[PDB]
Amino acid sequence: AVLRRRVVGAILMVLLGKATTLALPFAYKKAVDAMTLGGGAQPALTVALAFVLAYALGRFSGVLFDNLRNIVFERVGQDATRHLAENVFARLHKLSLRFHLARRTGEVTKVIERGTKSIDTMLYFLLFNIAPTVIELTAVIVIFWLNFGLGLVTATILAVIAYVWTTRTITEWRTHLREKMNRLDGQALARAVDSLLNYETVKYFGAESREEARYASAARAYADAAVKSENSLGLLNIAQALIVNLLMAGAMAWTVYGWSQGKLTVGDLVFVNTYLTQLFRPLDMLGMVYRTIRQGLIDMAEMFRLIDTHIEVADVPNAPALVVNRPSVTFDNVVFGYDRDREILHGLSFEVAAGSRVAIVGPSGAGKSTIARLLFRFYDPWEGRILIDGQDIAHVTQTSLRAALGIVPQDSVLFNDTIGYNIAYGRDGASRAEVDAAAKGAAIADFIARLPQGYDTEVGERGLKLSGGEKQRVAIARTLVKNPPILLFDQATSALDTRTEQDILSTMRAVASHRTTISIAHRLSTIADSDTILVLDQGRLAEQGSHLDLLRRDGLYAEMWARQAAE
Amino acid sequence: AVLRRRVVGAILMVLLGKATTLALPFAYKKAVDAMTLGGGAQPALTVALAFVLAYALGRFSGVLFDNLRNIVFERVGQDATRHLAENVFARLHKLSLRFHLARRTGEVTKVIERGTKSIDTMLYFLLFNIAPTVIELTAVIVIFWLNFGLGLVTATILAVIAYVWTTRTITEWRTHLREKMNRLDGQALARAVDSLLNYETVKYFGAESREEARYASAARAYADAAVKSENSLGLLNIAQALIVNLLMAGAMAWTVYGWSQGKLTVGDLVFVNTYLTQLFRPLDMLGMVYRTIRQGLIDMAEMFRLIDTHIEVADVPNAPALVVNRPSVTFDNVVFGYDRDREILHGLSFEVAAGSRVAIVGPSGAGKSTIARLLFRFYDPWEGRILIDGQDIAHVTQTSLRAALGIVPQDSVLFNDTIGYNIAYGRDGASRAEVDAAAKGAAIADFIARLPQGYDTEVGERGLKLSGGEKQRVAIARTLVKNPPILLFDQATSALDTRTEQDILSTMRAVASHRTTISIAHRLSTIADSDTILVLDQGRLAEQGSHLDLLRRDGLYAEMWARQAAE
Numbered sequence A, B: 001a002v003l004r005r006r007v008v009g010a011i012l013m014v015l016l017g018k019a020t021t022l023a024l025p026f027a028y029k030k031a032v033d034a035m036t037l038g039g040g041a042q043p044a045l046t047v048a049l050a051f052v053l054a055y056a057l058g059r060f061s062g063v064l065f066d067n068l069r070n071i072v073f074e075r076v077g078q079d080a081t082r083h084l085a086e087n088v089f090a091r092l093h094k095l096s097l098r099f100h101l102a103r104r105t106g107e108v109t110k111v112i113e114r115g116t117k118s119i120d121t122m123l124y125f126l127l128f129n130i131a132p133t134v135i136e137l138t139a140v141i142v143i144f145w146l147n148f149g150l151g152l153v154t155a156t157i158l159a160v161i162a163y164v165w166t167t168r169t170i171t172e173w174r175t176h177l178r179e180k181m182n183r184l185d186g187q188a189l190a191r192a193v194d195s196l197l198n199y200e201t202v203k204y205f206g207a208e209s210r211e212e213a214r215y216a217s218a219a220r221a222y223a224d225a226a227v228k229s230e231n232s233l234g235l236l237n238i239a240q241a242l243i244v245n246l247l248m249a250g251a252m253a254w255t256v257y258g259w260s261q262g263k264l265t266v267g268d269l270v271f272v273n274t275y276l277t278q279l280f281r282p283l284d285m286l287g288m289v290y291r292t293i294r295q296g297l298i299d300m301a302e303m304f305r306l307i308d309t310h311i312e313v314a315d316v317p318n319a320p321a322l323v324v325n326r327p328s329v330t331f332d333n334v335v336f337g338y339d340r341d342r343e344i345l346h347g348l349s350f351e352v353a354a355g356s357r358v359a360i361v362g363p364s365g366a367g368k369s370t371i372a373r374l375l376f377r378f379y380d381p382w383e384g385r386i387l388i389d390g391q392d393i394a395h396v397t398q399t400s401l402r403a404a405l406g407i408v409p410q411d412s413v414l415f416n417d418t419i420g421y422n423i424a425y426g427r428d429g430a431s432r433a434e435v436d437a438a439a440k441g442a443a444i445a446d447f448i449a450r451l452p453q454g455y456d457t458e459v460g461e462r463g464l465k466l467s468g469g470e471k472q473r474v475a476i477a478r479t480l481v482k483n484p485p486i487l488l489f490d491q492a493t494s495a496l497d498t499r500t501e502q503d504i505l506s507t508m509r510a511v512a513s514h515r516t517t518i519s520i521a522h523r524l525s526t527i528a529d530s531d532t533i534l535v536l537d538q539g540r541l542a543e544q545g546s547h548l549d550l551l552r553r554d555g556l557y558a559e560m561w562a563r564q565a566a567e
């Protein structure tokens, strides 16, 4: 509502700058009163005073208006940037898991910040350089048609057309170097950020100099590309300057052609030269702003290509919610692979009973975390389907599905905040009672109590300032705070000692009264008291049954289990 | 290097630009002689043509010289930028682990980009706006001091002094808003990046809207700060423009006062106004050049201040190298805490014998990964010391120390590249034979062979496109490729099943026959066949000895072992 008023005032400030653009010809009137009635009279002094008022205030009136425009437009501009940024962030959290797994933080950060800065500059240039230069050029044309004639304006319009054509050709020739420079910079920053993510790895193998040289190669490649791009910019500027200066010469040469004095001996030449000076400004601004908006649209296209192309998992039209009356999982002939060149799950079918305690075991690489990810609908299966209480996961909203599921993941990450924030993250606005209950049920309560800052101790980036077992128990506390009707533990008790592991096992058994618990574990002794044990091998269900049943069948599970008994 | 020659040419271009600066007033003299003499009917036609030619050529040569300066300085600028970026990166990889653990990637990235963007334009402005304007001011003052009295020149210098006072006052008032805006933008970007790092966590607890609103709050805070900063910038610009335009008014008022035609010479007024315009063009830049170099140097000071913040672990002067004749490690009364408010290790002392296979066990939080980190000298101990073959770790170079150690870490991270790159990352220039041997000793050979892209399969960011056990085995392959004289496995077989765990254990036993192996493990069954077992409790050495000996002692180790036997 008020942004409209602000931009209206901005256009009015543009019109006041147009009043200054009028004031510059106004000195033509001074020049008219110079030769006809000059020395030996009163007007000889009138040239001075009226000049200062026209000049001193006039120039001051111009810039003062321009900056005022800025101060009345900044809120409109920043909001737009913010409105983009928030939207970008809102879309950034709606991208598929494949992207955020295969992403390169460096080049994607470059693309995001570049797109934001591009729209930030492009809105300003679109609102403050297109319309003002168009108005000024229209006024130039009408004033030279009412004061000079038809020939000069036609010569100037064809000169400007050749100028625009040359600019377009040079920009089409420069686009290649521009894109190459951008790609090289993105690759360099991606390499730098990925090296910094593996700081500990770089220290572990004495590979500081290797990474230094690796980044240096990309840096000098980008440097060469930028040299080429800026030299192309300089060439375009030299061409534009040649066009402008030859047009200036033609305009200053065709005025004295009729007579030595012309129609107006004093005033014609000053009108022409002032208009040439105030014409070099719109061409200098217009070429740069046209190519700037071109690059801004290409950066917006790049950014929005990265953003909007990522539509993997989506809700069906008018999708109902998940109604969890019985927390029962059903994999029906599930066929899935992450990439089409390697199938991972081959017709997997199993029924996790409602309110049961089912374990999922198998050798490394068998595809257990893929079962977890498919249950969460991070990916969709190729064939078959997944049911929760007889409801197809593919035909229900993602929010209601993921709300009914709580997972302690294989590789858990924490926010760079305090312990209490991460623990309370399970539910939106968790009370200290709930957070303390989860921290007590996760064998982490005494540890936090012995902490000097307690729930306010820092965990650092990804939670790496805590131990492995402490971080595991923090993730357990999060999933306890959430308390959904389907609990899933993907190697949850790996980083724990046997004592804390038995504590967490007693907890998991206590909170599984009428709720479903799916425990993926390689430490078989923890899942020995489960209702059913599903053994997975190369993406197929090898065996299924009780611990005693599978031990007696003497198949894959028994061997594995007996492989624990070897030591 | 050769860049010196380039900058010489750059200054030459600058002087050629000054050749244009002379030519614009120099032409006006030829126009002066049209009023009184030149009435042979020939010279009236010579003066005009020569003026037009001189003006067109002057302007075109000016822009041409400027662009040539740019094109001959671009290589020097890019070189400088690249060298700065490389230095920043090199120092970024030499900061302590405390920084990279407590760092916030967003605001640090903001600071880095700010410093780079500042230096890129700062060098250009320092070399092409400071020195040219200084030379122009010296020439203007020395030539105009013999033609004008004391009043005008002293008024101009006092006007410039008042200009400097106004600029300094407004900049000192704006520095606060600038720094606050910078801090808010850094915090907003840090929050956004930390939310994106926890993408999976945000998906696990349905907290998209929470993070969206959090970033939106930070964004609107930054928007308000930026609006304030830009309004302050506009106020400074209007003040500077007022000062400059009133000075031009005073210069165009005290010169026209003497006579209607000229105060002291025939061409006083036009010479004065031409030099005033050709000084106002560089002056309008100068009012932006002081704050640009000031804020660029102060942001450089901020960046390099943060970087130069004295690192934690450093080499002693003239530090010798580590000579591992017998890999026997000795923690002698090691007292350490990460923060001063919580001590972790309380007088820890233990002797890992040369060529033995020692295990480190204990409850979660006891401080075992702290033993590993102190052995790597990521931190220095408060009391006591650490010895490798009787040599103080604190008195030896960090590089030679970390070369003698190879670690499979608790939380392993891979580079966003192929599997083969990560495996070969161990040694500098590893042969494909060694990489295949490591992949065979890490139970991944058959897996990678069954991969369609084999060693060229992507692992994604942090290696999260591979499983947990696959990533563990890849890290084992790295540490095997490195082949150092002291191997340390911090919960290396956690993500593996018992079968692959026995494979990796057979590997660990095939290697390190007469080498030291320190295994930190919670899965006690794997370390039961060790030479000695160090039990750690709350940061102290509880017991030590053989599996049978500690089992006989019926202490902390036995209890833990018995806790596996619970049914």
Ligand SMILES: Nc1ncnc2c1ncn2[C@@H]1O[C@H](COP(=O)(O)OP(=O)(O)OP(=O)(O)O)[C@@H](O)[C@H]1O
Pocket (backbone or CB within 6 Å): A101, A338, A339, A342, A344, A363, A364, A365, A366, A367, A368, A369, A370, A371, A410, A491, B460, B464, B465, B466, B467, B468, B469, B470, B495, B496
């Ligand atoms: N981003 C990806 N691209 C391609 N394949 C993937 C990706 N993520 C997972 N996989 C597939 O998943 C399988 C390995 O992960 P899986 O889901 O088996 O984990 P897991 O068996 O739970 O891990 P572990 O038992 O090793 O701890 C392999 O078949 C692998 O191809």
Ligand SMILES: Nc1ncnc2c1ncn2[C@@H]1O[C@H](COP(=O)(O)OP(=O)(O)OP(=O)(O)O)[C@@H](O)[C@H]1O
Pocket (backbone or CB within 6 Å): A464, A465, A466, A467, A468, A469, A470, A495, A496, B098, B101, B338, B339, B344, B362, B363, B364, B365, B366, B367, B368, B369, B370, B371
């Ligand atoms: N930079 C730091 N600032 C504060 N505390 C830290 C820092 N780094 C580590 N710690 C603390 O050290 C402890 C972890 O040390 P360590 O990882 O050796 O435990 P652990 O017993 O070996 O782990 P686990 O046995 O659970 O794998 C935690 O209490 C953690 O808070």
